[PDB]
Amino acid sequence: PVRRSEKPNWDYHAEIQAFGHRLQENFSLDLLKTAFVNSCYIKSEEAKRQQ
C-alpha cells in the first residue's frame, strides 16, 4: 500500500489547510507545516540528497 503522497490529486499546502479547517480549529500554517515534520524523514531526505 503506497502512501497517498504517491497518488493523484495531492497538494501539501492544500492538505495542510485541510488539517487546519477539518478539525474546526485554526492554526499557523507555517508552524503546522513544520509541525507535521518529524526528524526521521529529515534524516531520510538528507541521505537521499546524497544520491
Partner 1 sequence: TARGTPSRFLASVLHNGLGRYVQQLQRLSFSVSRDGASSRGAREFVEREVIDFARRNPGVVIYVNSRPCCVPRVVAEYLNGAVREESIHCKSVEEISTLVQKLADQS
Partner 2 sequence: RSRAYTPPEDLQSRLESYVKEVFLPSNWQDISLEDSRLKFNLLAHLADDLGHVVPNSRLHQMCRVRDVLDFYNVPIQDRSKFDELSASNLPPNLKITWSY
Query: Strand ranges (DSSP E) for the chain?
Result: none
Among 3, 6, 8, 51, binds partner 1 (CB under 8 A): 8
Q: Judged by CB under 8 A, does residue 15 bind partner 1?
A: yes
Closest CA to 32 of 23, 7, 40: 23
Query: What is the nearest approach in angstroms of partner 1 to the Cβ of residue 18?
Result: 6
**23: which DSSP letter?**
T
**Phi first, then psi: what are they for 44, rounded to 5°?**
-65, -45
18 vs 29, beta carbon nearer partner 1: 18
Q: Judged by CB under 8 A, does residue 17 bind partner 2?
A: yes
